[PDB]
Amino acid sequence: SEQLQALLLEEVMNSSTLSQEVSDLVEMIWAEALGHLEHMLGSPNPPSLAKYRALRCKIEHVEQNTEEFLRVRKEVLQNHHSKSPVDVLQIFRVGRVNETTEFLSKLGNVRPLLHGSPVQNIVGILCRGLLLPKVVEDRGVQRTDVGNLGSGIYFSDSLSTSIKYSHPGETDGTRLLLICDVALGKCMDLHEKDFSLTEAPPGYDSVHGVSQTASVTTDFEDDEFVVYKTNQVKMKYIIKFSMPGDQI
Ligand SMILES: Nc1ncnc2c1ncn2[C@@H]1O[C@H](C(=O)N2CCN(CC(=O)Nc3cccc4c3CNC4=O)CC2)[C@@H](O)[C@H]1O
């Protein structure tokens, strides 16, 4: 029958909705997260379409020769201050289901910034977006629960600082960080830590910890940008990269 011939072809057309480079990535971030829970609880390739659909997030490969690739690769390495070599492997356009509509694009000062995260967090981040940390009020607010700015979402403009948070995964030793449009708004510059910040100071939309220099000493080794409402973040790219000074 011809009806049967058409359904088998639609299965082909379904499985092809997933580039090989994107299936391989979805495998790795899933592998990394399963390897991590196995470890704290006791311990080509066929298109793994099932795992990608659960992320409710669209991931496209930008080809390593595209015009888009060389431009984005330039912007990541643009403020690489510690010139310890980095090999930018792959770049993926990204789009969360609800992110493009909830985004507060109308604040102004929308700037593209870097958020690093260990590889096991990537499944969580792609399914739910970048989440605010949980405030602590059952006990004394230690230095282990907050960052240097308070309970917010942290970005930098420098690959040198995002490499401090983009820890290499156990699966392949590659590092991931996101590129996100961040609606900064009115941005208060800070020179001293504040761990009590649950929101931006009055009249401002975000806060910026200013990195120490020989002229101006502050409490910040790195430039830190923090926002306090999740819909000031729109993820735009995943960057797969690797540090040569990781081997041997
Ligand atoms: N949906 C989600 N699924 C999984 N992990 C998720 C998630 N939303 C947020 N996270 C993860 O939670 C973490 C988090 O909030 N916090 C709380 C605040 N943060 C402060 C801090 O030092 N971060 C920090 C500071 C400066 C730069 C950079 C970062 C992280 N990325 C950077 O380039 C420390 C960790 C964060 O590392 C993020 O990767």
Author numbering: 316 to 358, 367 to 571
From the article:
PARP4 is an ADP-ribosyltransferase that uses NAD+ as a substrate to synthesize ADP-ribose modifications on molecules.
The HD was replaced with an 8-residue linker (GSGSGSGG) connecting L282 to S365. Structure refinement yielded a crystallographic R/RFREE of 0.203/0.248. We have also determined crystal structures of the PARP4 ART fold that illustrate that multiple alterations to the ‘acceptor’ site have rendered PARP4 incapable of PARylation, despite the H-Y-E motif.
